[PDB]
C-alpha cells in the first residue's frame, strides 16, 4: 500500500534471460509448427476458431520492440502458443505431440531461470 513496499526484486536481467529462453525454444527440433504465424488463408478453420493467434517469430518481434511490460506477459504469449496448439490439433498427431513437448521444455527453463 502507499509508502509500504515489499523488497525490490532485481528485474534488470529479465529482458536478456527471456531472449535466451526464446532462442532455445527457436532452435529445438520440435519448434517447426511454431516458428511462423499459421497461414490463415490456407488453413481452414484457424481464423474463426483461434481468437488470438501467436507464434515464436511474433513473440520475438514483441520482445525486441519493448512490447512486453514484464516477464509474466511474455510467459502468457508463450503459453498461448501451446494452448492454441491444443485447441486445434489432436494429442496423437505430430503437431499435437510437438506442442506438449515444447510446453514441457518451456516450463522447465522458466522455473530453473526465475523460481
PDB file of N, CA, C and O in Angstrom, residues 30-34 82 85 93-103:
ATOM      1  N   UNK A  30      11.543 -29.758 -32.393  1.00  0.00           N
ATOM      2  CA  UNK A  30      10.099 -29.751 -32.444  1.00  0.00           C
ATOM      3  C   UNK A  30       9.489 -28.339 -32.480  1.00  0.00           C
ATOM      4  O   UNK A  30       8.305 -28.211 -32.289  1.00  0.00           O
ATOM      5  N   UNK A  31      10.287 -27.314 -32.748  1.00  0.00           N
ATOM      6  CA  UNK A  31       9.754 -25.951 -32.871  1.00  0.00           C
ATOM      7  C   UNK A  31       9.002 -25.623 -34.177  1.00  0.00           C
ATOM      8  O   UNK A  31       8.336 -24.580 -34.236  1.00  0.00           O
ATOM      9  N   UNK A  32       9.104 -26.516 -35.183  1.00  0.00           N
ATOM     10  CA  UNK A  32       8.746 -26.207 -36.563  1.00  0.00           C
ATOM     11  C   UNK A  32       7.263 -25.822 -36.721  1.00  0.00           C
ATOM     12  O   UNK A  32       6.984 -24.937 -37.526  1.00  0.00           O
ATOM     13  N   UNK A  33       6.349 -26.407 -35.937  1.00  0.00           N
ATOM     14  CA  UNK A  33       4.955 -25.919 -36.086  1.00  0.00           C
ATOM     15  C   UNK A  33       4.698 -24.517 -35.566  1.00  0.00           C
ATOM     16  O   UNK A  33       3.564 -23.995 -35.787  1.00  0.00           O
ATOM     17  N   UNK A  34       5.690 -23.955 -34.832  1.00  0.00           N
ATOM     18  CA  UNK A  34       5.523 -22.751 -34.026  1.00  0.00           C
ATOM     19  C   UNK A  34       6.362 -21.558 -34.448  1.00  0.00           C
ATOM     20  O   UNK A  34       6.252 -20.533 -33.839  1.00  0.00           O
ATOM     21  N   UNK A  82       0.975 -22.752 -27.042  1.00  0.00           N
ATOM     22  CA  UNK A  82       0.683 -24.187 -26.789  1.00  0.00           C
ATOM     23  C   UNK A  82      -0.769 -24.471 -26.533  1.00  0.00           C
ATOM     24  O   UNK A  82      -1.248 -25.531 -26.913  1.00  0.00           O
ATOM     25  N   UNK A  85      -2.331 -24.594 -29.865  1.00  0.00           N
ATOM     26  CA  UNK A  85      -1.972 -25.896 -30.461  1.00  0.00           C
ATOM     27  C   UNK A  85      -2.905 -27.016 -29.959  1.00  0.00           C
ATOM     28  O   UNK A  85      -3.426 -27.786 -30.775  1.00  0.00           O
ATOM     29  N   UNK A  93      -0.988 -36.576 -32.825  1.00  0.00           N
ATOM     30  CA  UNK A  93      -0.551 -36.068 -34.129  1.00  0.00           C
ATOM     31  C   UNK A  93       0.850 -35.573 -33.914  1.00  0.00           C
ATOM     32  O   UNK A  93       1.296 -35.412 -32.785  1.00  0.00           O
ATOM     33  N   UNK A  94       1.590 -35.380 -34.988  1.00  0.00           N
ATOM     34  CA  UNK A  94       2.934 -34.869 -34.864  1.00  0.00           C
ATOM     35  C   UNK A  94       2.918 -33.468 -34.207  1.00  0.00           C
ATOM     36  O   UNK A  94       3.737 -33.204 -33.337  1.00  0.00           O
ATOM     37  N   UNK A  95       2.013 -32.601 -34.636  1.00  0.00           N
ATOM     38  CA  UNK A  95       1.947 -31.240 -34.147  1.00  0.00           C
ATOM     39  C   UNK A  95       1.459 -31.219 -32.688  1.00  0.00           C
ATOM     40  O   UNK A  95       1.978 -30.473 -31.859  1.00  0.00           O
ATOM     41  N   UNK A  96       0.506 -32.082 -32.377  1.00  0.00           N
ATOM     42  CA  UNK A  96      -0.035 -32.237 -31.023  1.00  0.00           C
ATOM     43  C   UNK A  96       1.036 -32.629 -30.009  1.00  0.00           C
ATOM     44  O   UNK A  96       1.094 -32.074 -28.904  1.00  0.00           O
ATOM     45  N   UNK A  97       1.880 -33.572 -30.405  1.00  0.00           N
ATOM     46  CA  UNK A  97       2.991 -34.036 -29.599  1.00  0.00           C
ATOM     47  C   UNK A  97       4.046 -32.948 -29.464  1.00  0.00           C
ATOM     48  O   UNK A  97       4.578 -32.714 -28.358  1.00  0.00           O
ATOM     49  N   UNK A  98       4.373 -32.316 -30.583  1.00  0.00           N
ATOM     50  CA  UNK A  98       5.331 -31.196 -30.596  1.00  0.00           C
ATOM     51  C   UNK A  98       4.935 -30.138 -29.560  1.00  0.00           C
ATOM     52  O   UNK A  98       5.784 -29.660 -28.791  1.00  0.00           O
ATOM     53  N   UNK A  99       3.648 -29.854 -29.496  1.00  0.00           N
ATOM     54  CA  UNK A  99       3.126 -28.889 -28.566  1.00  0.00           C
ATOM     55  C   UNK A  99       3.368 -29.257 -27.109  1.00  0.00           C
ATOM     56  O   UNK A  99       3.871 -28.437 -26.312  1.00  0.00           O
ATOM     57  N   UNK A 100       2.989 -30.475 -26.757  1.00  0.00           N
ATOM     58  CA  UNK A 100       3.200 -31.000 -25.408  1.00  0.00           C
ATOM     59  C   UNK A 100       4.664 -30.998 -25.026  1.00  0.00           C
ATOM     60  O   UNK A 100       4.952 -30.598 -23.915  1.00  0.00           O
ATOM     61  N   UNK A 101       5.554 -31.400 -25.947  1.00  0.00           N
ATOM     62  CA  UNK A 101       6.980 -31.451 -25.693  1.00  0.00           C
ATOM     63  C   UNK A 101       7.553 -30.036 -25.452  1.00  0.00           C
ATOM     64  O   UNK A 101       8.339 -29.823 -24.523  1.00  0.00           O
ATOM     65  N   UNK A 102       7.205 -29.084 -26.345  1.00  0.00           N
ATOM     66  CA  UNK A 102       7.695 -27.698 -26.263  1.00  0.00           C
ATOM     67  C   UNK A 102       7.225 -27.022 -24.977  1.00  0.00           C
ATOM     68  O   UNK A 102       7.962 -26.283 -24.390  1.00  0.00           O
ATOM     69  N   UNK A 103       5.989 -27.254 -24.575  1.00  0.00           N
ATOM     70  CA  UNK A 103       5.466 -26.691 -23.351  1.00  0.00           C
ATOM     71  C   UNK A 103       6.243 -27.194 -22.090  1.00  0.00           C
ATOM     72  O   UNK A 103       6.588 -26.397 -21.210  1.00  0.00           O
TER      73      UNK A 103
END
